[PDB]
Amino acid sequence: NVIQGQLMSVSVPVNTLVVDTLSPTSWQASTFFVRNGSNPEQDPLRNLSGQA
Amino acid sequence: MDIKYDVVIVGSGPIGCTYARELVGAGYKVAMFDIGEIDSGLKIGAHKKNTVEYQKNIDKFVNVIQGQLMSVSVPVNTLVVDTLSPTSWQASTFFVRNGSNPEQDPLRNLSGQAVTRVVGGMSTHWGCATPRFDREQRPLLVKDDADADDAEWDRLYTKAESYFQTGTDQFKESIRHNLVLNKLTEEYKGQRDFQQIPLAATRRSPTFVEWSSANTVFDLQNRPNTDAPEERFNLFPAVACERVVRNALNSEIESLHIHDLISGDRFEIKADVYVLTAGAVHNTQLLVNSGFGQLGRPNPANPPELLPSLGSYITEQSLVFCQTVMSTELIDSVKSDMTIRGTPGELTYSVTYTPGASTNKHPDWWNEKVKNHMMQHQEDPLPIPFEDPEPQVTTLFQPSHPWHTQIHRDAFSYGAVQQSIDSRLIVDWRFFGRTEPKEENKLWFSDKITDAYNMPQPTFDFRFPAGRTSKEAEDMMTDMCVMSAKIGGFLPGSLPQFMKPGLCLHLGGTHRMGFDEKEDNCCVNTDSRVFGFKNLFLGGCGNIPTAYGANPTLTAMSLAIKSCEYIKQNFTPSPF
Amino acid sequence: MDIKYDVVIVGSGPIGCTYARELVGAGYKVAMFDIGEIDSGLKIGAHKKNTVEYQKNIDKFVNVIQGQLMSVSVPVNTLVVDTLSPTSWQASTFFVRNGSNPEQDPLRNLSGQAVTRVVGGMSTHWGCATPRFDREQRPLLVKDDADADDAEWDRLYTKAESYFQTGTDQFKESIRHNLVLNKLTEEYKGQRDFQQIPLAATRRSPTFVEWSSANTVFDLQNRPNTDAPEERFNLFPAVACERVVRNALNSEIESLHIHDLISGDRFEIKADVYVLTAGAVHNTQLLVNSGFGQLGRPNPANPPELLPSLGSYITEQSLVFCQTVMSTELIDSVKSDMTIRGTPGELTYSVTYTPGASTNKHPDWWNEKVKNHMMQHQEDPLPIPFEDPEPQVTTLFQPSHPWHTQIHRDAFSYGAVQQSIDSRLIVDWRFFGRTEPKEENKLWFSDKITDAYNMPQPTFDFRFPAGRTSKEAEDMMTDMCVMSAKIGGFLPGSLPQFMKPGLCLHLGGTHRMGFDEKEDNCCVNTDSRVFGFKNLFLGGCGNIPTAYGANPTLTAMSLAIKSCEYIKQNFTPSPF
Amino acid sequence: VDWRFFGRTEPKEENKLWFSDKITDAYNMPQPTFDFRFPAGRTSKEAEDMMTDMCVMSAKIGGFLPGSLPQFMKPGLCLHLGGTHRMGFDEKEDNCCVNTDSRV
Ligand SMILES: *Cc1cc2c(cc1C)nc1c(=O)[nH]c(=O)nc-1n2C[C@H](O)[C@H](O)[C@H](O)COP(=O)(O)OP(=O)(O)OC[C@H]1O[C@@H](n2cnc3c(N)ncnc32)[C@H](O)[C@@H]1O
Ligand SMILES: *Cc1cc2c(cc1C)nc1c(=O)[nH]c(=O)nc-1n2C[C@H](O)[C@H](O)[C@H](O)COP(=O)(O)OP(=O)(O)OC[C@H]1O[C@@H](n2cnc3c(N)ncnc32)[C@H](O)[C@@H]1O
């Protein structure tokens, strides 16, 4: 837990995971927009995802 | 097989079988085709739960359901796997893979929508709930005369309930059922009414229910036969129906084009009357494949010439689910009439009641089951008999609670930790919302991509409408949270949640009914006859044009019965 | 139903059907009972995968399998749930709940063991692999004459393979199959041989295989009928067989006691010949319920009077599994014969080969499939055609690799992330170990606890034996890791692992065969006749007394064919 | 017992760490971006041979622990990144950034 608490990911690609069980009242974007500190330059297929 | 029939029916689900029942009985020469195969045993199209083994292992039945639900539209998968070995082959993109539909926006889908291709359709696995719709959920059959409209729905629903063997008392001797039913009655006294879910089912013994299906409505045996010597019916399984052929006038259907999946051959079939009962998705696909509506991605710049509302105004219900673990207060109530001496497992242990004691909260029969269970199974800490049937409770949709409710048990795949909880304690909660019909919510068919039967690939463009539909959906969730707490707390792993869109499989409005094609933005009239066409009829939930929360099948069958009255009045059976 | 038959058969799986095929054909008056129901469509007891819908959706078939596998022995669950609401009822102990078996030690179980109660048994869902056993895996039918023993097994296996429609070439036109087969041949040159898994199956088209089943061996239709007018057979589904009644001499069976699950009535059935083919678990249960062996927890202080080796020396195979993702080297090999100009998706793009080029690594037909796929589907990055059949590769058990191997695809439930990998790349690896028979490994039946049919509850006391069995099991895992790496890296989520004990469903030895009851510690002789008894025979994997790694069904059928030779030679059919 | 086997990666010009000219990280510095794949040829063959070697060697000690089965870890979890500002004798000939005294 100490280790994980001090390893900050270098490059996180834009997340395209589909959540389709939100309530109909919840706000949602119509796209997978650059969110949550993701790096839009990053190809998720040519990454070092584990680099921190 | 002959080339010419009086009536042809596409699909062998319960709605096709309603047509078959009515029309074979009226003496028409009838053919029914189904793309799927016979696989329910000797009773063709019967419910798969009606085996002794599923009645003793009911949770295994989830697997039967899942094994015959094939996803309608799966978007291209973009999940990153970055722990492959460096030697494994990988593409540089998320390419169209594994039967995914590239037309599909993963954010405007009914991901949970699925279809069943087997003789008897989805009625080989369904839950058999058959409530009537109240006025608010129901389309008009009579204009400007509410009493006359009620009377007509009553006549039709009554017949439909006979065809399905609908009843409301098959679970009346269940302790668990009565425990839930009574508590909720008491808690909502003067606010809401609770009753048994109306269920298409006949109890055969205390541990066996014969669930109804297509086979209950019509047995699907070829005729003439010894029991029906003057009737004429043939069922042709493993036949993909691909198109109905319109005359140039667009006034009549001239043939049905089929593909025999066993021989591989294609044929045309001729009939006086053509009935499409392939389900809400597949009726639409067949029509669009026959030049109704618009093939391809919607294009308003280019409105279709025939049935422009086809595939628009589609509705699916919102669904919320949880499970509860029965409260201590309620379990203790079960044994309230009992005197208990000594300690379980010893010789002096005694559980007794006074039959007829005026202070008894329960009938003698309930108390006998409980005493006997507690004295026979002294290692068991619960007062509920092991073979006690499940709860089957509803409060039906009303204006002040505009959702359908099922408080019940059906087959479920309990994870390992959930298996730690005694099943007698667990109750499932499913609340179903009504969805406003909106032109923008569409089922359409690709002009380039094809499905597994080489038909135009279905694609959804759906979102739950803003406004009432969404407010009610969230109010429904809150209502399940409030109501469920009266019975027990949530079961870990089955916490309150929205189910993926379309999992409820109550899709409607894809080929909707109304009085007037333009004014009511619809495809069929109140006899389920396709506007413009003399001899084409559509059956099923696709016909329902309203926002409904209740399970739609009974309502669809009712419309089918009306549709067959029109047929009997307007087409003469051939001589035998 | 009559009261008297020439032969009665308990169970309608493939082994019962072998008896039925041989004995109905020999003119005996035959009854077969099965506790399960007809549910494979019109072809009674046929494989459930032989529908068009499962052949287009093969992964859905896992659900069919899981829906008909009922766990034999589930220990009491001790999983702690401590996130219930304080209002929910809870016991203060982990009490016997949810059909758990309190006799069962969770640490000496076959947790993965399960049974199938349906007409046709497990052959309605099985994988159809039918290898022969080599000498090392195989029991003796002839003593002190190895060549004579080989000759006898050859005669019997050859007939069994005819009954099952066993073949080794149904997958020969698969690119994927040949890609795997060839690579592994090359890598083990001079060390091991690879071939197609022998499969009970007939190819009907490039996209449809008719998998064999009980129905292939015998069609299970009542006789006399139009095709077999001088034969006599009745199948009675939904009949629980409970006991065979021994004479006081313990020299003959006098009746079969049955329970009709539909009427609820119990009857006795009389026959000259009694054949038990209910599976390895249920044959044992029936025998113990009839006073063979010992009911209750083993007690050596009190050895049974009849068949003291019944339920001892049980064997189940160890099973290791993984999936791979095909290597880049191998995928590129597929298109080695191709010249490629331009870029995919453009007008100039060209994929060509020179038919007959001496430097071609592949036959023209392979290259035609590949060229056509690459030119027709230029958005697809793989050279393998979409409808290419699966790999079906084996290297059969040998002394230097004493395990059976299947390098293949069968129905599988891929998780969401796994669905991200193109299915054409994925290969399943299943290696099966042989288990030394040990007296201490037992299937026994409770004297107090009962199962869902009110029969004595089965309980296992099993561990994989120390010594060779365990060393080989781990060497097998290492061998799969080494061999699989030649084809590709592991698929995340399907990494190398031991499967729970008994999931392979290859249980043997529960009612084992040998020459001499005491010296060979066994229950039946080489005609599958129960020692002491003139007219009682047992069929199935329970008969196999050796340590085997290969799939046992073909071997069991072979023994059944020998058993019927004895019957035909020793019992006269009644006159018709 | 834990088993961790670590492979060597061939240095390839095409494998890059670069920095965005538009996107910034949490300290307002140019956002790092990788363009990496394990090189074809030796690096990838050895990586798979390494996996097989761990499977073979580990079996001498015991069987795998369920839930910790043999697997490749996500790229870069080992945190042994090298070569981003690599050393050599001659800047052009050795394609490098610092000399053997680590001087730029
Ligand atoms: C699956 C499901 C269904 C369900 C249920 C629970 C589950 C898990 N619970 C419900 C319940 O409690 N109450 C109820 O009212 N609905 C519930 N359902 C849904 C219900 O089963 C369906 O509404 C009902 O069966 C619909 O009936 P219908 O006759 O309209 O349609 P179907 O059963 O899908 O049968 C259609 C058939 O047509 C075939 N087919 C499809 N395409 C073709 C082509 N091209 N050619 C020839 N035949 C075609 C099918 O194979 C099928 O049998
Ligand atoms: C389930 C399974 C099976 C399997 C397979 C894969 C799966 C997922 N893959 C295998 C394969 O590739 N090759 C092979 O050799 N084996 C494979 N199998 C196993 C195979 O199906 C079984 O070995 C085979 O079917 C055994 O045949 P048998 O005829 O001995 O037994 P059965 O099929 O279990 O049928 C027994 C029947 O008897 C009934 N029954 C049980 N108890 C009673 C009582 N008391 N009274 C009357 N009937 C009884 C059953 O209901 C059943 O049909």
Side-chain angles (χ1 to χ4, degrees):
Chain A
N1 295 116
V2 181
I3 294 171
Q4 295 160 353
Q6 61 183 37
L7 283 176
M8 276 64 168
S9 300
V10 173
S11 191
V12 180
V14 171
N15 183 297
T16 61
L17 269 158
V18 167
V19 178
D20 56 7
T21 60
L22 305 159
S23 171
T25 57
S26 279
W27 190 93
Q28 278 297 283
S30 286
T31 73
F32 299 106
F33 68 97
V34 180
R35 268 167 291 165
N36 296 339
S38 55
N39 184 1
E41 306 276 25
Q42 183 69 60
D43 184 336
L45 302 185
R46 307 188 70 87
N47 202 3
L48 292 180
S49 63
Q51 264 285 318
Chain B
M1 176 162 17
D2 290 339
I3 267 326
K4 178 57 178 39
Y5 299 85
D6 293 347
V7 179
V8 291
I9 295 154
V10 175
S12 72
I15 304 309
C17 289
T18 303
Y19 281 92
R21 190 206 185 106
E22 291 292 14
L23 303 171
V24 170
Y28 293 86
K29 188 186 176 206
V30 180
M32 180 183 267
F33 303 92
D34 199 297
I35 201 163
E37 292 173 93
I38 299 175
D39 77 353
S40 285
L42 300 173
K43 299 184 182 201
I44 301 168
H47 203 295
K48 292 174 179 188
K49 208 150 46 173
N50 289 349
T51 70
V52 174
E53 185 77 334
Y54 286 122
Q55 305 255 348
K56 300 174 172 285
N57 290 282
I58 197 269
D59 287 326
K60 288 274 160 166
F61 202 73
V62 189
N63 295 116
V64 181
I65 294 171
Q66 295 160 353
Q68 61 183 37
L69 283 176
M70 276 64 168
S71 300
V72 173
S73 191
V74 180
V76 171
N77 183 297
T78 61
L79 269 158
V80 167
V81 178
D82 56 7
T83 60
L84 305 159
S85 171
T87 57
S88 279
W89 190 93
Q90 278 297 283
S92 286
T93 73
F94 299 106
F95 68 97
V96 180
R97 268 167 291 165
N98 296 339
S100 55
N101 184 1
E103 306 276 25
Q104 183 69 60
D105 184 336
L107 302 185
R108 307 188 70 87
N109 202 3
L110 292 180
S111 63
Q113 264 285 318
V115 293
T116 297
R117 299 182 186 85
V118 308
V119 166
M122 295 185 172
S123 79
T124 64
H125 76 247
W126 71 318
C128 293
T130 61
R132 302 180 179 207
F133 289 4
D134 68 338
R135 286 182 190 173
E136 189 173 18
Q137 284 184 91
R138 192 171 76 192
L140 289 174
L141 285 183
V142 186
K143 33 185 318 174
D144 306 319
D145 191 347
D147 277 357
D149 183 73
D150 281 359
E152 175 74 350
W153 276 106
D154 180 50
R155 181 185 73 74
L156 289 171
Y157 272 136
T158 294
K159 191 163 187 210
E161 284 169 351
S162 181
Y163 290 0
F164 262 145
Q165 298 293 290
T166 293
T168 60
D169 61 329
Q170 306 93 328
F171 288 81
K172 70 175 174 189
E173 265 153 11
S174 166
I175 290 182
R176 291 187 288 157
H177 174 70
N178 283 288
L179 182 72
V180 168
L181 182 50
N182 295 343
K183 178 57 152 172
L184 300 171
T185 295
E186 177 182 328
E187 290 281 324
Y188 290 88
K189 232 214 198 191
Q191 299 167 243
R192 301 182 191 190
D193 306 312
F194 291 81
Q195 60 166 80
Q196 197 195 274
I197 299 166
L199 289 167
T202 308
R203 186 167 289 285
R204 298 305 180 181
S205 76
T207 51
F208 197 93
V209 173
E210 178 165 9
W211 300 100
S212 308
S213 59
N215 177 268
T216 312
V217 182
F218 181 68
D219 67 28
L220 287 166
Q221 295 286 142
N222 291 344
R223 294 149 159 71
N225 65 34
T226 303
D227 310 297
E230 292 160 347
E231 293 174 359
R232 293 175 287 175
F233 175 81
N234 293 81
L235 167 77
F236 296 104
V239 180
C241 296
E242 296 189 319
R243 280 196 282 116
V244 289
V245 171
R246 290 170 298 109
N247 70 355
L249 286 182
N250 290 316
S251 72
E252 187 179 85
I253 293 298
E254 303 310 329
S255 66
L256 168 71
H257 181 82
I258 62 163
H259 176 212
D260 190 306
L261 298 174
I262 302 315
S263 72
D265 293 336
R266 285 182 163 82
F267 302 78
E268 293 267 6
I269 304 277
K270 258 246 86 130
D272 305 331
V273 172
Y274 300 79
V275 179
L276 301 182
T277 54
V281 170
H282 286 126
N283 277 348
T284 319
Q285 185 189 55
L286 188 40
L287 292 165
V288 172
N289 203 51
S290 306
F292 294 92
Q294 196 176 57
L295 191 69
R297 184 169 287 282
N299 179 205
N302 198 237
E305 90 136 335
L306 288 185
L307 290 192
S309 297
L310 185 61
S312 293
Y313 310 88
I314 79 173
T315 63
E316 177 57 290
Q317 296 169 352
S318 295
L319 171 65
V320 300
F321 161 84
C322 71
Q323 295 167 308
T324 56
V325 177
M326 208 85 75
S327 70
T328 300
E329 221 159 51
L330 283 182
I331 292 308
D332 282 347
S333 83
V334 175
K335 56 190 182 158
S336 62
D337 291 337
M338 301 299 145
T339 289
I340 304 194
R341 293 174 282 157
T343 112
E346 306 182 339
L347 266 8
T348 57
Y349 183 66
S350 174
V351 179
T352 61
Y353 75 102
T354 300
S358 66
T359 72
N360 286 355
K361 309 286 173 189
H362 314 278
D364 287 351
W365 74 253
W366 164 306
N367 280 328
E368 194 66 10
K369 289 179 157 186
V370 167
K371 170 210 139 226
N372 290 334
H373 173 81
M374 297 183 61
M375 290 293 298
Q376 291 158 12
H377 301 283
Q378 288 173 39
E379 76 289 352
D380 190 63
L382 287 172
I384 302 169
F386 294 125
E387 285 180 300
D388 188 52
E390 35 283 299
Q392 298 285 0
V393 174
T394 188
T395 183
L396 292 179
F397 180 118
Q398 297 293 343
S400 66
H401 46 103
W403 33 88
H404 171 59
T405 62
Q406 290 187 182
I407 303 155
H408 72 142
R409 292 284 291 279
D410 69 0
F412 190 87
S413 22
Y414 292 100
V417 195
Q418 292 187 137
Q419 290 199 267
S420 199
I421 308 303
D422 187 285
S423 49
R424 284 166 295 169
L425 301 162
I426 296 168
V427 175
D428 308 348
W429 302 71
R430 287 184 179 80
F431 289 20
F432 300 84
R434 58 156 175 196
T435 297
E436 189 166 340
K438 297 289 200 169
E439 187 180 11
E440 56 268 32
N441 282 332
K442 290 183 200 299
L443 168 56
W444 60 263
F445 298 88
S446 183
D447 61 25
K448 188 216 168 301
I449 306 295
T450 53
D451 66 12
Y453 290 93
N454 242 90
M455 292 284 281
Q457 171 60 45
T459 309
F460 292 112
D461 187 338
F462 185 90
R463 281 267 180 98
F464 287 103
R468 191 183 74 182
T469 301
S470 292
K471 179 170 190 287
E472 289 182 352
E474 181 53 34
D475 291 350
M476 183 182 66
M477 173 57 88
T478 308
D479 202 56
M480 182 192 63
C481 292
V482 168
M483 186 183 306
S484 68
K486 296 179 183 341
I487 300 307
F490 306 127
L491 175 74
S494 292
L495 306 174
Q497 66 194 270
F498 281 90
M499 301 309 294
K500 79 193 354 177
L503 221 46
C504 48
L505 300 172
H506 286 169
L507 176 74
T510 56
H511 51 80
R512 66 208 302 263
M513 182 177 283
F515 289 111
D516 186 81
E517 177 177 12
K518 184 183 186 61
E519 183 155 357
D520 301 312
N521 304 120
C522 55
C523 301
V524 298
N525 74 6
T526 61
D527 306 306
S528 300
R529 192 174 60 75
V530 168
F531 294 104
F533 288 76
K534 294 183 270 212
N535 67 335
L536 181 55
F537 307 84
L538 319 179
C541 303
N543 285 338
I544 306 167
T546 45
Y548 60 90
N551 323 63
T553 313
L554 192 67
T555 296
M557 175 180 277
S558 300
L559 291 181
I561 290 167
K562 187 171 188 61
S563 181
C564 291
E565 299 175 334
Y566 180 87
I567 296 173
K568 288 177 219 184
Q569 286 161 25
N570 289 283
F571 297 90
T572 309
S574 70
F576 192 157
Chain C
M1 176 162 17
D2 290 339
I3 267 326
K4 178 57 178 39
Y5 299 85
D6 293 347
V7 179
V8 291
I9 295 154
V10 175
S12 72
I15 304 309
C17 289
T18 303
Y19 281 92
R21 190 206 185 106
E22 291 292 14
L23 303 171
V24 170
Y28 293 86
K29 188 186 176 206
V30 180
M32 180 183 267
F33 303 92
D34 199 297
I35 201 163
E37 292 173 93
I38 299 175
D39 77 353
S40 285
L42 300 173
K43 299 184 182 201
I44 301 168
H47 203 295
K48 292 174 179 188
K49 208 150 46 173
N50 289 349
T51 70
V52 174
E53 185 77 334
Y54 286 122
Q55 305 255 348
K56 300 174 172 285
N57 290 282
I58 197 269
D59 287 326
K60 288 274 160 166
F61 202 73
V62 189
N63 295 116
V64 181
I65 294 171
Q66 295 160 353
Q68 61 183 37
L69 283 176
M70 276 64 168
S71 300
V72 173
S73 191
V74 180
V76 171
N77 183 297
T78 61
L79 269 158
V80 167
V81 178
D82 56 7
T83 60
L84 305 159
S85 171
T87 57
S88 279
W89 190 93
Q90 278 297 283
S92 286
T93 73
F94 299 106
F95 68 97
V96 180
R97 268 167 291 165
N98 296 339
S100 55
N101 184 1
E103 306 276 25
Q104 183 69 60
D105 184 336
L107 302 185
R108 307 188 70 87
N109 202 3
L110 292 180
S111 63
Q113 264 285 318
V115 293
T116 297
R117 299 182 186 85
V118 308
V119 166
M122 295 185 172
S123 79
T124 64
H125 76 247
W126 71 318
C128 293
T130 61
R132 302 180 179 207
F133 289 4
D134 68 338
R135 286 182 190 173
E136 189 173 18
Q137 284 184 91
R138 192 171 76 192
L140 289 174
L141 285 183
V142 186
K143 33 185 318 174
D144 306 319
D145 191 347
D147 277 357
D149 183 73
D150 281 359
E152 175 74 350
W153 276 106
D154 180 50
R155 181 185 73 74
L156 289 171
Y157 272 136
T158 294
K159 191 163 187 210
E161 284 169 351
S162 181
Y163 290 0
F164 262 145
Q165 298 293 290
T166 293
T168 60
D169 61 329
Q170 306 93 328
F171 288 81
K172 70 175 174 189
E173 265 153 11
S174 166
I175 290 182
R176 291 187 288 157
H177 174 70
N178 283 288
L179 182 72
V180 168
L181 182 50
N182 295 343
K183 178 57 152 172
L184 300 171
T185 295
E186 177 182 328
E187 290 281 324
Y188 290 88
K189 232 214 198 191
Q191 299 167 243
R192 301 182 191 190
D193 306 312
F194 291 81
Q195 60 166 80
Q196 197 195 274
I197 299 166
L199 289 167
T202 308
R203 186 167 289 285
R204 298 305 180 181
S205 76
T207 51
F208 197 93
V209 173
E210 178 165 9
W211 300 100
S212 308
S213 59
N215 177 268
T216 312
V217 182
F218 181 68
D219 67 28
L220 287 166
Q221 295 286 142
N222 291 344
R223 294 149 159 71
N225 65 34
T226 303
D227 310 297
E230 292 160 347
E231 293 174 359
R232 293 175 287 175
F233 175 81
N234 293 81
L235 167 77
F236 296 104
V239 180
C241 296
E242 296 189 319
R243 280 196 282 116
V244 289
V245 171
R246 290 170 298 109
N247 70 355
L249 286 182
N250 290 316
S251 72
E252 187 179 85
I253 293 298
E254 303 310 329
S255 66
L256 168 71
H257 181 82
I258 62 163
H259 176 212
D260 190 306
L261 298 174
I262 302 315
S263 72
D265 293 336
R266 285 182 163 82
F267 302 78
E268 293 267 6
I269 304 277
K270 258 246 86 130
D272 305 331
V273 172
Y274 300 79
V275 179
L276 301 182
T277 54
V281 170
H282 286 126
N283 277 348
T284 319
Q285 185 189 55
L286 188 40
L287 292 165
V288 172
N289 203 51
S290 306
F292 294 92
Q294 196 176 57
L295 191 69
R297 184 169 287 282
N299 179 205
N302 198 237
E305 90 136 335
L306 288 185
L307 290 192
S309 297
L310 185 61
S312 293
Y313 310 88
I314 79 173
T315 63
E316 177 57 290
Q317 296 169 352
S318 295
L319 171 65
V320 300
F321 161 84
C322 71
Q323 295 167 308
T324 56
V325 177
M326 208 85 75
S327 70
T328 300
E329 221 159 51
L330 283 182
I331 292 308
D332 282 347
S333 83
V334 175
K335 56 190 182 158
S336 62
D337 291 337
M338 301 299 145
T339 289
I340 304 194
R341 293 174 282 157
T343 112
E346 306 182 339
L347 266 8
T348 57
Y349 183 66
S350 174
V351 179
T352 61
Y353 75 102
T354 300
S358 66
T359 72
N360 286 355
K361 309 286 173 189
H362 314 278
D364 287 351
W365 74 253
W366 164 306
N367 280 328
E368 194 66 10
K369 289 179 157 186
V370 167
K371 170 210 139 226
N372 290 334
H373 173 81
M374 297 183 61
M375 290 293 298
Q376 291 158 12
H377 301 283
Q378 288 173 39
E379 76 289 352
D380 190 63
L382 287 172
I384 302 169
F386 294 125
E387 285 180 300
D388 188 52
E390 35 283 299
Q392 298 285 0
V393 174
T394 188
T395 183
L396 292 179
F397 180 118
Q398 297 293 343
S400 66
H401 46 103
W403 33 88
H404 171 59
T405 62
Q406 290 187 182
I407 303 155
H408 72 142
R409 292 284 291 279
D410 69 0
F412 190 87
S413 22
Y414 292 100
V417 195
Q418 292 187 137
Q419 290 199 267
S420 199
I421 308 303
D422 187 285
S423 49
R424 284 166 295 169
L425 301 162
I426 296 168
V427 175
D428 308 348
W429 302 71
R430 287 184 179 80
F431 289 20
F432 300 84
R434 58 156 175 196
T435 297
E436 189 166 340
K438 297 289 200 169
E439 187 180 11
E440 56 268 32
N441 282 332
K442 290 183 200 299
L443 168 56
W444 60 263
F445 298 88
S446 183
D447 61 25
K448 188 216 168 301
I449 306 295
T450 53
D451 66 12
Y453 290 93
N454 242 90
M455 292 284 281
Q457 171 60 45
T459 309
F460 292 112
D461 187 338
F462 185 90
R463 281 267 180 98
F464 287 103
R468 191 183 74 182
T469 301
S470 292
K471 179 170 190 287
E472 289 182 352
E474 181 53 34
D475 291 350
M476 183 182 66
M477 173 57 88
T478 308
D479 202 56
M480 182 192 63
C481 292
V482 168
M483 186 183 306
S484 68
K486 296 179 183 341
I487 300 307
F490 306 127
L491 175 74
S494 292
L495 306 174
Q497 66 194 270
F498 281 90
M499 301 309 294
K500 79 193 354 177
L503 221 46
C504 48
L505 300 172
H506 286 169
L507 176 74
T510 56
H511 51 80
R512 66 208 302 263
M513 182 177 283
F515 289 111
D516 186 81
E517 177 177 12
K518 184 183 186 61
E519 183 155 357
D520 301 312
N521 304 120
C522 55
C523 301
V524 298
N525 74 6
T526 61
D527 306 306
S528 300
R529 192 174 60 75
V530 168
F531 294 104
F533 288 76
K534 294 183 270 212
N535 67 335
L536 181 55
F537 307 84
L538 319 179
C541 303
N543 285 338
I544 306 167
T546 45
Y548 60 90
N551 323 63
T553 313
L554 192 67
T555 296
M557 175 180 277
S558 300
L559 291 181
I561 290 167
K562 187 171 188 61
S563 181
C564 291
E565 299 175 334
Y566 180 87
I567 296 173
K568 288 177 219 184
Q569 286 161 25
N570 289 283
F571 297 90
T572 309
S574 70
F576 192 157
Chain D
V1 175
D2 308 348
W3 302 71
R4 287 184 179 80
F5 289 20
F6 300 84
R8 58 156 175 196
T9 297
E10 189 166 340
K12 297 289 200 169
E13 187 180 11
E14 56 268 32
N15 282 332
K16 290 183 200 299
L17 168 56
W18 60 263
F19 298 88
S20 183
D21 61 25
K22 188 216 168 301
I23 306 295
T24 53
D25 66 12
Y27 290 93
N28 242 90
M29 292 284 281
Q31 171 60 45
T33 309
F34 292 112
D35 187 338
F36 185 90
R37 281 267 180 98
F38 287 103
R42 191 183 74 182
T43 301
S44 292
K45 179 170 190 287
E46 289 182 352
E48 181 53 34
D49 291 350
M50 183 182 66
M51 173 57 88
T52 308
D53 202 56
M54 182 192 63
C55 292
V56 168
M57 186 183 306
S58 68
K60 296 179 183 341
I61 300 307
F64 306 127
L65 175 74
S68 292
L69 306 174
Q71 66 194 270
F72 281 90
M73 301 309 294
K74 79 193 354 177
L77 221 46
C78 48
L79 300 172
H80 286 169
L81 176 74
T84 56
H85 51 80
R86 66 208 302 263
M87 182 177 283
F89 289 111
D90 186 81
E91 177 177 12
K92 184 183 186 61
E93 183 155 357
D94 301 312
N95 304 120
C96 55
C97 301
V98 298
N99 74 6
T100 61
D101 306 306
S102 300
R103 192 174 60 75
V104 168

